Amino acid sequence: SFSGYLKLTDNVYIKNADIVEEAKKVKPTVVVNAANVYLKHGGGVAGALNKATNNAMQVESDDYIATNGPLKVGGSCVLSGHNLAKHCLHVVGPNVNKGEDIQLLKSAYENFNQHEVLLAPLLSAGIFGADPIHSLRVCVDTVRTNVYLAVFDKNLYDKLVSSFL
């Protein structure tokens, strides 16, 4: 299963790892994507996950959007995990660099509660512009299922562990 994770709470675990590499090694049941409402996987975790699937995630996502329209900020959809996981849970956290309401981050993490175990990034962190310390706090206070967080940046991982209440 998952290895080298630091236990933060009863159900939240954290590791300094590349989520693509982590997904390829573990092949978890669910890998969470840091998605946008259009499922346009251009950069960040989304761009990296999509590139690992040889663009198959984008082709599948475009068909999903053509049929269903965009997701809501705070919402999600379950699609194939391709070569990375059984499923990919595309979760839309608020993008602070788009003026989106940071209060929607709790709604975004609530999507994780529909899955017993997930490999995930910190929602709204990185290119989404939110404070990753706040995202970890919302994660631990919202997610009740087993979440294994992959934090790409070593310096951010150290700051998150060292400042964890």
Ligand X SMILES: O=c1cc(Br)cc[nH]1
| Positions in the binding site for ligand X (CB under 6 A) | 18-20, 44-45, 48, 126, 152
Q: Which helix (H) or strand (E) holds 6?
A: strand 6-7
Q: 35 or 113: whose CB is closer to ligand X?
A: 35
**In the complex, least distance from residue 78 CB atom to ligand X, rounded to whole angstroms:** 21
**Which residues sit opposite 146 in a β-bridge?**
117
Residue with the shortest CB distance to ligand X: 48
CA distance linking residue 80 with residue 90, whole number of Å? 10
Q: 63 or 153: whose CB is closer to ligand X?
A: 153
**In the complex, least distance from residue 144 CB atom to ligand X, rounded to whole angstroms:** 25
Q: 51 or 66: whose CB is closer to ligand X?
A: 51
Task: State the DSSP string of 41-61.
Answer: --SHHHHHHHHHTTTHHHHHH
Tell me, rounded to whole angstroms, the distance of Cα 123 from its chain centroid.
6
**In the complex, least distance from residue 149 CB atom to ligand X, rounded to whole angstroms:** 12
